[PDB]
Design a protein around this ligand. Structure first.
Ligand SMILES: Nc1ncnc2c1ncn2[C@@H]1O[C@H](COP(=O)(O)OP(=O)(O)O)[C@@H](O)[C@H]1O
Length: 431
């Protein structure tokens, strides 16, 4: 991007990382500029940056590595007194010793014992007692993104040692802390009444005039129809696999296999393994190309299918010939006694997927012109907020049943965390 707008909030963040002791949590909603400012922040700073994420797909997308692979953490709940097999390699140790800045994308998805373990490994590597071995830490993401649900034994082992299952519940945050900065500008659009509604929902202060609005979105006839510009936000995998499958059909189906070269982890693949399409299929772009004219999340309709090309008419009327795209799986290594990234593998596939319906999870980070929300009756805290944040307007939302005060379940650990640091200096943890 030679396009980047640099806002007051971004410069505020760069001012503070300048002081090598300042950890920073960079937060903001979808379309807030986070991953674009992330790239801005690697280039503009000194520092030896390392870029990690809690999942392969987020790692690939941010162009870093998983936290587990970088730091060699077995998957599972880890108490402070669970002992670590900590080796890595001579390249890895040496990379971590040169790291001047650790950047973690999608931090709200980091179950806090992960943070503490990373802290243990970096004290053992630097042979220091300082938090994170002194490494400076920038954290990116959206607080009100739902963290991954903790399994049976997970909450078991861990509840003994943690007051919470959110990333800021990490024990290290008793010994260190971080500033907070909200990215407030939504570049693709600006719609104040709707975003106010969303913020009243997430803070559990919400008018009867707002509840009137929410009951309007009900249209049961549309909700039950798959011929439309609307994408169904659904909670669970298989309702989507069923909607996207049933609309596809058996008629005139083209199938396109993924291609893997060298080393790619199965869970880091952010595209279809077997892409099954037909003229008429409804689809969504998986990558940003400003030159071709598509963004990740852009919806269109297939108008033709060839071997190496897929032609799609998007909702903005443009027509785009999609070609296979290649995703690169990297890792950190030494070249010339400098820590640099290197490609260890690849996966190649057309960057589209069937879009009649998308999970709440796979749609993390995205917004659409038109959406169909399913009030799932039984509800989990913050769920209604998530579902509605997938739209860009109020008037673009359609609910399958009335939206009721019942459906609004606050997450109070988040409102308080938010409430505190907002009055405590935009800082949380030990000063
Ligand atoms: N700093 C910026 N300046 C100008 N436009 C931006 C900026 N950041 C994002 N955009 C636009 O908004 C879109 C949102 O993408 P992204 O930066 O990934 O936001 P987020 O990750 O916070 O949802 C981009 O496709 C881009 O076209």
């Amino acid at each position: 991007m030679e396009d980047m707008i640099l806002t007051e909030e971004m410069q505020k963040i760069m001012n503070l990382i300048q002081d090598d002791e300042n950890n920073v949590f960079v937060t903001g909603k979808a379309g807030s500029g986070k991953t674009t400012f992330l790239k801005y922040l690697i280039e503009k700073s000194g520092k030896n940056c390392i870029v990690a994420a809690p999942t392969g797909i987020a790692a690939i997308n941010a162009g870093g590595v998983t936290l587990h692979s970088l730091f060699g953490i077995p998957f599972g709940p880890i108490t402070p007194y669970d002992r670590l097999e900590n080796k890595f390699s001579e390249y890895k140790v040496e990379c971590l010793l040169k790291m001047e800045l650790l950047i973690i994308d999608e931090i709200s998805m980091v179950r806090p014992d992960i943070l503490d373990t990373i802290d243990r490994k970096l004290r053992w590597v630097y042979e220091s007692d300082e938090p994170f071995g002194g490494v400076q830490v920038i954290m990116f993401g959206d607080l009100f993104q739902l963290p991954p649900v903790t399994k049976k034994q997970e909450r078991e082992i861990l509840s003994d040692f943690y007051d919470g299952f959110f990333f800021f519940n990490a024990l290290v945050f008793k010994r260190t802390g971080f500033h907070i900065v909200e990215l407030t500008k939504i570049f693709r659009q600006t719609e104040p009444e709707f975003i106010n509604v969303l913020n009243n929902i997430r803070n559990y202060q919400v008018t009867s005039d707002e509840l009137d609005l929410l009951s309007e979105l009900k249209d049961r006839k549309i909700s039950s129809s798959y011929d439309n510009e609307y994408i169904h936000i659904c909670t669970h995998k298989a309702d989507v696999e069923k909607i996207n499958a049933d609309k596809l059909g058996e008629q005139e189906i083209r199938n396109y296999d993924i291609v893997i070269k060298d080393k790619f982890p199965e869970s880091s693949i952010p595209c279809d393994l077997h892409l099954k399409l037909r003229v008429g299929a409804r689809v969504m772009s998986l990558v940003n190309d400003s030159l071709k004219g598509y963004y990740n999340g852009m919806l269109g309709i297939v108008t033709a299918l060839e071997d190496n090309v897929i032609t799609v008419r998007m909702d903005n009327g443009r027509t785009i010939k999609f070609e296979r795209y290649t995703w690169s799986n990297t890792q950190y290594t030494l070249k010339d006694n400098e820590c640099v990234k290197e490609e260890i593998g690849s996966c190649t596939q057309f960057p589209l997927t069937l879009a009649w319906a998308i999970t709440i999870h796979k749609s993390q980070g995205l917004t659409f012109d038109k959406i169909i929300i399913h009030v799932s009756h039984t509800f989990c805290p913050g769920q209604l907020y998530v579902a509605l944040s997938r739209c860009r307007t109020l008037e673009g939302i359609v609910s399958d049943a009335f939206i009721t005060k019942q459906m609004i379940i606050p997450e109070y650990a988040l409102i308080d965390f938010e409430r505190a640091y907002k009055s405590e200096g935009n800082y949380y943890g030990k000063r």
